[PDB]
Structures are given as structure tokens and as C-alpha cells.
Amino acid sequence: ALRGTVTDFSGFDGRADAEVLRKAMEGLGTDEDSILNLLTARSNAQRQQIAEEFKTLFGRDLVNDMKSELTGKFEKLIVALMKPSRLYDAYELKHALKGAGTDEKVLTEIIASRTPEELRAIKQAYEEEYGSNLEDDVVGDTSGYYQRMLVVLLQANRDPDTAIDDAQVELDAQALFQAGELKWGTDEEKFITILGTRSVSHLRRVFDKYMTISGFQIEETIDRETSGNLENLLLAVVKSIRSIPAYLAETLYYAMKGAGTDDHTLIRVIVSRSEIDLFNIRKEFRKNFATSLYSMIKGDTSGDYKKALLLLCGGEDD
Numbered sequence: 001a002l003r004g005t006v007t008d009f010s011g012f013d014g015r016a017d018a019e020v021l022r023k024a025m026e027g028l029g030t031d032e033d034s035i036l037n038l039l040t041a042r043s044n045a046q047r048q049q050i051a052e053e054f055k056t057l058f059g060r061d062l063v064n065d066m067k068s069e070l071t072g073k074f075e076k077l078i079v080a081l082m083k084p085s086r087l088y089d090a091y092e093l094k095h096a097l098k099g100a101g102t103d104e105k106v107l108t109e110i111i112a113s114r115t116p117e118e119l120r121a122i123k124q125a126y127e128e129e130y131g132s133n134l135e136d137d138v139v140g141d142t143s144g145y146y147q148r149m150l151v152v153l154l155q156a157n158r159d160p161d162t163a164i165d166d167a168q169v170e171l172d173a174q175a176l177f178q179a180g181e182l183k184w185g186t187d188e189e190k191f192i193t194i195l196g197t198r199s200v201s202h203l204r205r206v207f208d209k210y211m212t213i214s215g216f217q218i219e220e221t222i223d224r225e226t227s228g229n230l231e232n233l234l235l236a237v238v239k240s241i242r243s244i245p246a247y248l249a250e251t252l253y254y255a256m257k258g259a260g261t262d263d264h265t266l267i268r269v270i271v272s273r274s275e276i277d278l279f280n281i282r283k284e285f286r287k288n289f290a291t292s293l294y295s296m297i298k299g300d301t302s303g304d305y306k307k308a309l310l311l312l313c314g315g316e317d318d
């Protein structure tokens, strides 16, 4: 099934680890290698225990100390790595909504790729942490059908995968055909209801039937019928239905596409999926882009930041 690249470290000694981190920061200077070599070789749960022992032994906050010692991208990677797994997605969403503006590629990327079970956990954590309702903050920072689609997904009430009903597959495929290609204009409400609430296994069948009856892949029709945030979200949902690892592998690829690199996106994906499906993401990356994720990162990043990412990612050969 799904496989991550980071797992619990055998022979874990939180207190021992904490002292190593302390010695790497005490006195003038910072031993970045020691810190990165250790934190990327411990699971997220173990990092939290190290943070606890650190505070018990020295009465100091590990994260705050590292924010003082580290700088730049490397610092941001480490801070993201120390973020509790249960709160990371909520943290990112909160920071995509806060301030004047809103990073919609972040809202779209997370809300479309996370399962209903993950979204329920995210909604809870967000509320506890920031004292506000996630849905309400999303509604407040977005509008139109893009907003409605996001709200539909945030309900996390997608139908469960059951036995496939061929007639319902034909019905849904024809409904999409009629709502888009055969309509002057577009019936967005129809696309949202179907793509947002039908079961994954069901939609995979619908996608093939749609192709069969219309000659177009659902992705092409979406591009031909919609635009803006809505188009990006619909494409993300369709891609996620087909394969979450594939979608995220594509999200990463375009992050390091050409000039410069989208570091924020590079960090978020690697960190958030490290203990879930980053291994799968690697395989999908290699199979669709003729290169390994490792190499891509290897030539798109520099310094400690680079060394840290590579250890997390792994797979020098893929």
C-alpha cells in the first residue's frame, strides 16, 4: 500500500538525542550537519519526544532555539519538520488564509488531495489551535463556484466505495457530457456535486465512460469549459481521484520547473507526506518525468537545505 520514507528509529533515546542537539547549538556557532542528520532520521513522533526531553533537561524550547540558530530555507524546513503531524496541514491552511490575500494553490492542493478521514482530523485540529472554524475562514476568503467546491469537499461526506452500479456510471457520464460539452455555457453545479460527492471507485469508472462517449478525457473538458481557481481545483480533484501520489508528484515537478523553485511547496509536500506516501510519490515521479525526485532536488537546491531534503526524500537511484 502507501509507504513513507521516514519511519521510527530503533534504539531511540530521546534524552540522548536532546543532548546532541544542545551541544550542536551551545556556544558560538551552529553545527547544522549534526542537527539535520539527526532530525531527518527520527519520525515526527520521536521529534516531539526529543522536544519534550530538551525542555525537561534544559528548560529551553527546542524549536525557538533553532529559530535563533538557523536561517533561510534550511530553518523553514526544520521548523516544518518539528511541527506535529496532526497540526501541519492545519498550520499551512491557516497561513494560506491569514493576512490580506490568500494562497489559493495551497487551499486547492491540500483540500483536494486529502481523504475525507484526513479532512475531519484537519478540521478539528484547526479549530482547537486557532479558535475559529476552518469552513468559515475559507468561505470568508473565497467566492463563486471555487468556494462552493471547497465547501463541498470540507464536508468530508464523499460516498463510500461500494459495488459499482453500471447504470449509475452511465447516468453520471452522460450528465457530465450534457453539463459541459453539449451546453452553451456550463452547469458548474453538476460538476461539483458529481466530482465532489461520488465515491472514488465510482468516479474512476465515470472518467473512462466519459472518455468513451465523448472522445475527451475529463481533464480536457474541464480546461475547455472552465477557468480560474475553479479549473485548477477541478483538475486537482480529478487527478487526486485517479491517484493522490501522481497528483503530488506532479505538484512537486512543477515546483522545480525551470527558473528558480517554489520552496514553500517543495517543503510542504516532502514534509507532509514523508510518513504517508512519499515513497509512492517517488515512483510516480520517476515513471512520468523520466527522472528521479532526488536528482531534481539535487540540482535545484543548495547547502544544508539540500542535504536535509535529500535525506528525507531518499532514493538516489529511482
Ligand SMILES: [Ca+2]
Binding pocket: 024, 025, 026, 027, 028, 029, 030, 069
Ligand atoms: Ca549557538
Ligand SMILES: [Ca+2]
Binding pocket: 097, 098, 099, 100, 101, 102, 141
Ligand atoms: Ca486573506
Ligand SMILES: [Ca+2]
Binding pocket: 179, 180, 181, 182, 183, 184, 185, 186, 225
Ligand atoms: Ca459548454
Ligand SMILES: [Ca+2]
Binding pocket: 222, 223, 224, 226, 227, 228, 231
Ligand atoms: Ca482553461
Ligand SMILES: [Ca+2]
Binding pocket: 255, 256, 257, 258, 259, 260, 261, 300
Ligand atoms: Ca528550478
